[PDB]
Amino acid sequence: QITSTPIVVDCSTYVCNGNVRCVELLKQYTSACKTIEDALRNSARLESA
Amino acid sequence: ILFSKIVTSGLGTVDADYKNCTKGLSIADLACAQYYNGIMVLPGVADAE
Amino acid sequence: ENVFAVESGGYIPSDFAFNNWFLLTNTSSVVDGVVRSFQPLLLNCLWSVSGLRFTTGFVYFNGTGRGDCKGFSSDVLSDVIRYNLNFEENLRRGTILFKTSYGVVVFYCTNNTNFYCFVNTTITTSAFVGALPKTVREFVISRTGHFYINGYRYFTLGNVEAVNFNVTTAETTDFFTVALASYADVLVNVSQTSIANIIYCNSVINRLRCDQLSFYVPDGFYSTSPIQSVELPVSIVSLPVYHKHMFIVLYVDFKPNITLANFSHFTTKYVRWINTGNCPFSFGKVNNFVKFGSVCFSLCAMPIVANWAYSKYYTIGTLYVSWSDGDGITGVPQPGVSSFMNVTLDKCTKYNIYDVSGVGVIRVSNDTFLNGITYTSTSGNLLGFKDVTKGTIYSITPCNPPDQLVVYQQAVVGAMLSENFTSYGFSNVVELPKFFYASNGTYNCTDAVLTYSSFGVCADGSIIAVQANLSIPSNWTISVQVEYLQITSTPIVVDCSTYVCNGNVRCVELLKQYTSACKTIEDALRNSARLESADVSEMLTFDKKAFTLANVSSFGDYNLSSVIPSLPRVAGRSAIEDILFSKIVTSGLGTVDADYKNCTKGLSIADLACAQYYNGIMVLPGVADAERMAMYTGSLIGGIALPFSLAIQARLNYVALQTDVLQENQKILAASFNKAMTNIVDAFTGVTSQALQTVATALNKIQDVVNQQGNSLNHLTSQLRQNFQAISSSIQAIYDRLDPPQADQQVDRLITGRLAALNVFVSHTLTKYTEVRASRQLAQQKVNECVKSQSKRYGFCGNGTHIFSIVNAAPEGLVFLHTVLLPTQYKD
Amino acid sequence: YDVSGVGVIRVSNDTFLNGITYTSTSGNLLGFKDVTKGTIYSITPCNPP
Amino acid sequence: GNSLNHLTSQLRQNFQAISSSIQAIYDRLDPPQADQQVDRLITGRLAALNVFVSHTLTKYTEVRASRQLAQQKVNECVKSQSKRYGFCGNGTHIFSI
Amino acid sequence: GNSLNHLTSQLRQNFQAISSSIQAIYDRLDPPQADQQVDRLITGRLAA
Amino acid sequence: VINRLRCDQLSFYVPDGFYSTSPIQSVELPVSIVSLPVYHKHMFIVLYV
Numbered sequence A: 001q002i003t004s005t006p007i008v009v010d011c012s013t014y015v016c017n018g019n020v021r022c023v024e025l026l027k028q029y030t031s032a033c034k035t036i037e038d039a040l041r042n043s044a045r046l047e048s049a
Numbered sequence B: 001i002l003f004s005k006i007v008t009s010g011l012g013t014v015d016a017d018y019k020n021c022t023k024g025l026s027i028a029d030l031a032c033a034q035y036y037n038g039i040m041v042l043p044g045v046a047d048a049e
Numbered sequence C: 001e002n003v004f005a006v007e008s009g010g011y012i013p014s015d016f017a018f019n020n021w022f023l024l025t026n027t028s029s030v031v032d033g034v035v036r037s038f039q040p041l042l043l044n045c046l047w048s049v050s051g052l053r054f055t056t057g058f059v060y061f062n063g064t065g066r067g068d069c070k071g072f073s074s075d076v077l078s079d080v081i082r083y084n085l086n087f088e089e090n091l092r093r094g095t096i097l098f099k100t101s102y103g104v105v106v107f108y109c110t111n112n113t114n115f116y117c118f119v120n121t122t123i124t125t126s127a128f129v130g131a132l133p134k135t136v137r138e139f140v141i142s143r144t145g146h147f148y149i150n151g152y153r154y155f156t157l158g159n160v161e162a163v164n165f166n167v168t169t170a171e172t173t174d175f176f177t178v179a180l181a182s183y184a185d186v187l188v189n190v191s192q193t194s195i196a197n198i199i200y201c202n203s204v205i206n207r208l209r210c211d212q213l214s215f216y217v218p219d220g221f222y223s224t225s226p227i228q229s230v231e232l233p234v235s236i237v238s239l240p241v242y243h244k245h246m247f248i249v250l251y252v253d254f255k256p257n258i259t260l261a262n263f264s265h266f267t268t269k270y271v272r273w274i275n276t277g278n279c280p281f282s283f284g285k286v287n288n289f290v291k292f293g294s295v296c297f298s299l300c301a302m303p304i305v306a307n308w309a310y311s312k313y314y315t316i317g318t319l320y321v322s323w324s325d326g327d328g329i330t331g332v333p334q335p336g337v338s339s340f341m342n343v344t345l346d347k348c349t350k351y352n353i354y355d356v357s358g359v360g361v362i363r364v365s366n367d368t369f370l371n372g373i374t375y376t377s378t379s380g381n382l383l384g385f386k387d388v389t390k391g392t393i394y395s396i397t398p399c400n401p402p403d404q405l406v407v408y409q410q411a412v413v414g415a416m417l418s419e420n421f422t423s424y425g426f427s428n429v430v431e432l433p434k435f436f437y438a439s440n441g442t443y444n445c446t447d448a449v450l451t452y453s454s455f456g457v458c459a460d461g462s463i464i465a466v467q468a469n470l471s472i473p474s475n476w477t478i479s480v481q482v483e484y485l486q487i488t489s490t491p492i493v494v495d496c497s498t499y500v501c502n503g504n505v506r507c508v509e510l511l512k513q514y515t516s517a518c519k520t521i522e523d524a525l526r527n528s529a530r531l532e533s534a535d536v537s538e539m540l541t542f543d544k545k546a547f548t549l550a551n552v553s554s555f556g557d558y559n560l561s562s563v564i565p566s567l568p569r570v571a572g573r574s575a576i577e578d579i580l581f582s583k584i585v586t587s588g589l590g591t592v593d594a595d596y597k598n599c600t601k602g603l604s605i606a607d608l609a610c611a612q613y614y615n616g617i618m619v620l621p622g623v624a625d626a627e628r629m630a631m632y633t634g635s636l637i638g639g640i641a642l643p644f645s646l647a648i649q650a651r652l653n654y655v656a657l658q659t660d661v662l663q664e665n666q667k668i669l670a671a672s673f674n675k676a677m678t679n680i681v682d683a684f685t686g687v688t689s690q691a692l693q694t695v696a697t698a699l700n701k702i703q704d705v706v707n708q709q710g711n712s713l714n715h716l717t718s719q720l721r722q723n724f725q726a727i728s729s730s731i732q733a734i735y736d737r738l739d740p741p742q743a744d745q746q747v748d749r750l751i752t753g754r755l756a757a758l759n760v761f762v763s764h765t766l767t768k769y770t771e772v773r774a775s776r777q778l779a780q781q782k783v784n785e786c787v788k789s790q791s792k793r794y795g796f797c798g799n800g801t802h803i804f805s806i807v808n809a810a811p812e813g814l815v816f817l818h819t820v821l822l823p824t825q826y827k828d
Numbered sequence D: 001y002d003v004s005g006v007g008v009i010r011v012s013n014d015t016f017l018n019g020i021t022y023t024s025t026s027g028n029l030l031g032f033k034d035v036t037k038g039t040i041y042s043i044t045p046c047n048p049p
Numbered sequence E: 001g002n003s004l005n006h007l008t009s010q011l012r013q014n015f016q017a018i019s020s021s022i023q024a025i026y027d028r029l030d031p032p033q034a035d036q037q038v039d040r041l042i043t044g045r046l047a048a049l050n051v052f053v054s055h056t057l058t059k060y061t062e063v064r065a066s067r068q069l070a071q072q073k074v075n076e077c078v079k080s081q082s083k084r085y086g087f088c089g090n091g092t093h094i095f096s097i
Numbered sequence F: 001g002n003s004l005n006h007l008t009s010q011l012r013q014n015f016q017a018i019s020s021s022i023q024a025i026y027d028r029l030d031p032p033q034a035d036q037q038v039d040r041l042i043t044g045r046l047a048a
Numbered sequence G: 001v002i003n004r005l006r007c008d009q010l011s012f013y014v015p016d017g018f019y020s021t022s023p024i025q026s027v028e029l030p031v032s033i034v035s036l037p038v039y040h041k042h043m044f045i046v047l048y049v
Ligand SMILES: *[C@@H]1O[C@H](CO)[C@@H](O[C@@H]2O[C@H](CO)[C@@H](O[C@@H]3O[C@H](CO)[C@@H](O)[C@H](O)[C@@H]3O)[C@H](O)[C@H]2NC(C)=O)[C@H](O)[C@H]1NC(C)=O
Pocket: C024, C025, C026, C038, C144, C146, C153, C183
């Protein structure tokens, strides 16, 4: 096996399914999105390089 | 032959093509079902070419 | 005067110092940190009125009464009025007057009756309200009636039309600025509970910054979903039924008389003096197509509660409902056959199709499925439906699915999309095999900077794919190239008990039942930190004599002045590293230095480094201390010095004998060296396409690497607010409210939450370390292959023919100053 | 101010205008103002690790 | 396939909310109680997402070893004759494609 | 040792459910509510 | 103290290293309260059994 296929997720769209009020409420979970999607983006970058 | 013998899994597609996704002409195939949840399968690094 | 011209669009001019603009709050003002919040900071007017012209003079929220606004004006309804004073007698004398929809209110304060403050009200009555703080200097009123002093909400007046002063200055020096404000939402750099500076969440890039809590943005492919329309048309689809209606109407009358009339479809009506109670539905909201099998109403319990001034509550009665689940009862917005089907295509539309409710864009589809009526994905979202009246199949695509942006030099250059039209103000759209790509570039560029797995984007945003006598150069130029490699991560350790139980002794004594939970966490952290310290400690060799060969005199015409580690300790940091450490903006989210000597001595309120220490998040001292790094790098520099230009000439000789060690060429190459050195120190200090772009990349990568640690730390220290479905977020408050039997049944939720939080944070740590390890091994390899040696491959040690390389300390990392030769000024 | 807790209370020489209760990101109180005298009392937990 | 299905199916469960659809919640109740409903869903979604991250990171670190091995095996047995038995197959190596 | 102990001890916690044991919880309640009770145990055990 | 630590390790041997610990707060504590001024109109509720 040489490579997986990199995946990326988008926090707010997954969690709130696009309800604007839910997204306004998700701001209270400080950095709760950042630390997920960063841990996916950086690994995808490493796999590509 | 290998590419024909190995069968993709209906649990989740692992390569997707987004450009037709928002056109609405048809009910979405599994790739756009995922894409409406923000799961965005990226193009594989090692293209067959 | 620090008074300013507000710019068109209501922006504060970015260099304003805010020297009295307190951040307003209803509670618990913060000490330090980046916050994202709504605040009244979009200004319709600011005018400065000096003591020469203090007069009585009301202001309405419609802006009438305003003075000569400075710089800009607008006539929208402002929501708030902010008064910034400069005269110390403040509100101690004179009075504030207010107009309300049913009377007049006046605020005054008196000591001789400290200044205890009172209100007079006429539809006449008076009330005690509070006491004047030591010096009011800024104060604010909301149109809804909240009154704020020095940022804190003291009382409410209800809705107010206009505000007025019976006030005069003490001296001709004095003036006050009055400004009409409305809410923006903003990112604020708070320090010492002062504002330092802000950014508005206006533009897209500012949306990113406003939702990464980061003033810097790295380069990379950040995703977003564009904001939806504030309003929607409504569509409804139903199965045809035999139509019949019942009104349910609740009548209220009182004096300090509730009745039900007559006490397949139905609807509900309700008709400074209703709550949902324990019912799993809300009166009125029942109309929103909730279902029941049957329903009964009687004078679960919905108490009807009168309020006075939002200050007293009186349960004037209770309505009881009983309901069965099932169908045949639904809300309907209006009261014998055939279903309505008001459906709008293309417009993003709230829908209730077959009692599945959502938002999306409905469209006609060419698909023809004989089975079914609604089609769903595995996630349970509605995808499409069949009009039973016709067999028409419709598809339910959500509006604004996520895009991916390309950010470079803190600008948006390009955007991948799933649709063929431009957006965001970009110019042209090209179709690539799996997506569209909008941008503003023109495709003349030939060299990318970002690599989307298999594509490049160049500075314009143009996507590019990537994969007889001779004109020998007459001369070879030298150039400099920079690599940054991360080499360590600063270990963190958590005291599991003091984090989870906050030190409350009952909680600590409860935690013991969570057998070995804390052990297997803190043990994983400790073991990682040991390994980190050992693996770095072993890597930093030394040799005293080899180091001592390094001195700036001992290099002739090649001016390494900025690299040679400074005279202290064996040494101090060298000038380039000094530049970097001053250049990198330290994170506002998580301080990764520590000093615990001060955290209890208490002379000043705890700064972040102690604030996160009280929860046990003990940042350990770094394993690669500055002095040791300087000593190592010095030993390397003296190693490569080991005549100083004669070794260089030996290399030039090898790469081209007859040209590159001619004395004139030697001198020229010394000049080229000094030039390149100067150009890079220029680029690091402030204001080339294969040179300074390397500097840009290294500064980006370093700022990124700092930022990602700060955010990992802030996740953990921010989950302490989260109440995990318990009565309240503070353990002490719970034990005050409950007897131990119920107290434990509540506190078990906080414990099972916070242990999840730690079992995540440990994962962030251990994966970060495993990413670092590969980098450290690679850096070691590059030390062996390309400073202590001469490279035998292009590219691996700079794009160029190898001559020599140089090593310096940097935030958690090493910088390699490679140098290489390039062909130049060809002759046939 | 209806925040209940345990701590050492100590007068502190730092002075501010804004606000009343000073709190960290974790929501622990770090110090409170005396409205009547303007001294700021810092709050420090007993037995930090 | 299993990893993606698990992730995209956690999205269906109700995590002790009244309903697994956010629009249903905001339709049925009044915002101050609907919020302390929806915070259950939000926490459950975040949990599942943070599991899926760990599936991805483990899969990457497991494949990294295999890739580095494959690059070693090619650097041997195609660019050269092999110099040992067994490493590139039971028998005496000649070449590999 | 500690790894495996931390695994096996999670069964004792009731995860806010009425009881830490499935038989008891399914005995004392009616199925359409015992089921959404035991949901809590399921989710807790999976996270462990 | 070392036994107090062992009781947290659930082990009779404690490998050499650095371990985090916290001393124990005292068994009795002064109550202290601070409040804004308010108009007072105290009421009793007294239940008799
Ligand atoms: C302190 O608490 C009060 C309420 O507890 C906050 O006042 C509320 O502020 C929001 C926005 O800041 C107001 O919402 C606005 O209402 C108008 C109604 O016409 C609407 O047009 C706007 O689009 C927006 O929805 C809200 O009405 C107002 N009052 C209440 C009772 O909610 C105040 O902001 C809080 N202060 C801080 C610093 O948090």
